[model samples]
Target: LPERLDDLTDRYDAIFCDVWGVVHNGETSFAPAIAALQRARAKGVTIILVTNSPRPHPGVVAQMSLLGVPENAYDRVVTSGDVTRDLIAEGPRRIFHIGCERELAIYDGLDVELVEEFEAAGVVCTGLYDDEVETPEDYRELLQRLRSRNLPFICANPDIMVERGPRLIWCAGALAREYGQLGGRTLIAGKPHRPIYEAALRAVESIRGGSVDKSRILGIGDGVLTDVKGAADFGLDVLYISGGVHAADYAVNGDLDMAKMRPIASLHALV
Candidate 1:
């Protein structure tokens, strides 16, 4: 993207890298990517591994371990799950968990009521019924039923889907999007949203012991909306990775539909 991470080393004092598309692709570590992280760290740069993951940093680290991403890949990890919990804490009492059971860790110490789908005062989602084996269409009827009752929904991961090697898997954002289409209200916590970016800034500041200029930072990722738009909106320079989601928009490999990219690309200064 930048020729090399080294090309960016002199440009940015700090780096905010995306997890899903830039790193492991949901399976194993990308060897060169791991080397790039090592290179960034070796240069004394403040590396903030920002992600739209709905799980907290610990849960993310455990998965990273399984994926063979060693320690030293980045300085600190900031996830949407970490910020989503803070947002969820200020919401209504009863919550309807719409994602997987394991994602409950985000609410570990929160004082919130979790109830059945119909009985919930609000709905919190991380993904569809079974993201690995399900689709957003399966939840339309449920969403319509909830909409009739005026139930509100909260989306933890705003990513529509994530890269799992060469395939794509649906995330909570897709379901919440369908809910919105059904005239239901939906609040999202993740990239392209201020809350998650603010949380990430806090994480970066905590490590730096002082605030860093938004200009001295760089964001490298593939998603047009989440990573690309989020970075630009947050005032960070973005390096769009064409090998990610937008790969499908190309007539041939490496060619992008700038028409499709323009609406979001116009939001920020992109290279």
Candidate 2:
């Protein structure tokens, strides 16, 4: 098993770190994780806070600041919403939005027109309209209606759920999953998908003024599917922070129990 993050600093030129679970739980920042990124920055490693937040970069950045994650922890932020913009641009102009009203910033400045469901030629789902008191089942009728029209369902955030303080909240991916299962076409550009990673690399190149070798980049996150699978499939080395989403399955007294995590770890070759 890997030891301290400091030990891996010199080996990587950049680190694609996840935001929600790794740097902060919704209500507060993870001090040690922030410090580790800051330390990595001090060592000349470029830290990119990659997240599945469906909002554009500025809002997510502002939210991070409010959550106590300092601006210096990472070099740049690449979000699924940012990537979703590209997909939106290439889609039908009359789109229907299916997420929180606050997430409309994603459509800001685009030529797209936000229309009601009946007039929509396509759909963009960032998440449930109200996640606090809603579930995917609540959208069955809405999703069914969209499916009947065969509208292109664009999932801005591909995370099925994210930690919000002490609770796990549903995300856009759950809705997109339902849409696909109902025979609707769904588009995704987040982790576990290729588009977001490509966008991240573009940001890396913009900062460094040249292409950096993929082998020199390190990926770290707590989600197995989004973080681990995404990094592994994209050909970059990854570090799985077990204390986040899947803790209950492998943690003993709030510490990692390798024996219990063995099956999961071995499947991912986490050792």
Candidate 3:
């Protein structure tokens, strides 16, 4: 149990939590975190799950259901994928998407057009398609053409890498970073950024039937770069779980230094 868990629960009227590391280890769910969400629901605190996943909110919720997160556990859920979809939908641009067929299904009902060649495109979107494909190196020519054409990029996920069970896989962020390095402009829809937070706040406000006091909001997550940095940047109180994806890095040192983790104020050591 975390020493500040009670204090955290008592202070916040709403919580914005990350999905991957805090709630699950990519394969299994964390019962204590689920219990904490349930407790927050019982206490009428709005729980909004904010994730940098490349999938939309519906896909994320369905995945969570399989991982033991009940449908009612959260008031609302938001993902970078959802924001990415919105960005494309709001424009009448032609997109040259570089991702899996399944991942592209999220754009099915949207009005945006899709093209395969950069000469016919006005924008680009990328997500991981499968395990067999190589990294963005596999798409160098296509990316270069898009860069030369000055097409805007909508990166669905900002996570450079994710732990998939025992293996680590590169995400859409990797491709976005690569494109950025090549001088292409990229628009990230997820964490450590502002759009996702704005979307989450709107969801919270909808549930509360009014605006929420930003001061009473708390953010809890396992990823420091995305979740903690996002919370700090958004001016919300943050509680970090040290036992997240990067635990191995700190485990070797046997201590978590606050100076090393600069943005967040509260720390919770996961068991």
Candidate 4:
């Protein structure tokens, strides 16, 4: 059944689990979720918390500690920031950054130079500089100006939105979406992209001392576009959590309505 994570642990040697919605919702840790992950690890399954956070793995580790997600629940963390670094390194050195000042960790140790938007040879978007009060529309004119330059836009986090406590906030992917609509070249470094998935597989293999077949790796996440499509496209079986992000779509009087979930199940062919 799709309901029990415990029943499925033995079937896989490793699991590429998502961090945001599944483990924690950007505020406090979910005790049941972390406990389930702990149980999965105890069963000898290697757990890799794959996240689209623009922060590197170390940054994520630090945040996890603060959020009360125990260290033992996961074997390792692979982040889009790690992959974004590589993308940044390969691209033009003069980069225009579009994200909060706190997200500078993504550029740490990189050879790239941060410059003004018009002077940029390439553009990288981690997310809104102030997602608390900003939306994609806020960058409409800014993005239009960059698009005119034909700069290659690198989206560090490919999530359109993520839950932050009781609120939903826009992400880098939303900006990338608008850029793409304007005919600007956009490169996504996170989920639903090959770079992060390839990095995650290598991380698993390094710990296992052997290559684990894709069939033996299970993908678990709540995002429909990022996690579900990303895993499925990479040829890994995925477990989808219906209670996050799209919870409202399936909620009928504040309760999950099976009738609504049926469409997603059938669409994804989720068993």
Model 2, range 1-271, lDDT digits (tens) per residue?
4556777778899989888877878898878888888999999899888898999999999999999889998999999999999999999999999999999999999999999999999999988888898988889998999999989999998887777898767788888888998999999999878888998988988898899888999888776668777888888888777666642222212333454321112112111
- Those runs of model 1 whose alpha carbons end farther than 4 Å from true positions after fitting are 246-259, 262-271
lDDT of 1 by residue, 1-271 (tens): 2466677678777888778767777786677877887888898888888888889889988888799989888888888888888768878879988889888888889999899876788888877667778777778788888889888788888877777787777787778778887888988878888887787788778888898888888877777777778888889887666655543222211244676662212211112
Off by over 4 Å in 4: 247-271
Candidates by lDDT, descending order: 2, 4, 1, 3
lDDT of 4 by residue, 1-271 (tens): 3456777777899999888877877797788888888988888899999999998899899988999988999999999989989989999999999999989889888888999977899999998999999988889999999999889999998877778888878888888888999999998778878889999999999999999999999888876667877889888988877666542122212233454321122112211
The reply for model 3, stretches above 4 Å from the true place, is 1-4, 247-271
Better candidate number, 1 or 3, judged by TM-score: 1
Clashing residue pairs in all predictions, respectively, total 0, 0, 0, 0
Instruction: Kindly list the per-residue Cα lDDT of model 3 for residues 116-191, writing each as its tens digit.
Output: 6734555545565563556667767877888998888888888766665665566777778778989998888688
lDDT agreement of model 1 with the native:
0.77
Error of 3 at 81 (Å): 1.3
Instruction: Give the C-alpha miss distance for residue 87 in model 4, angstroms.
Output: 0.9
Stretches of candidate 2 off by over 4 Å are: 246-271
Candidate 3 local distance difference test against the native: 0.75
TM-score of every prediction relative to native: 0.90, 0.90, 0.87, 0.91
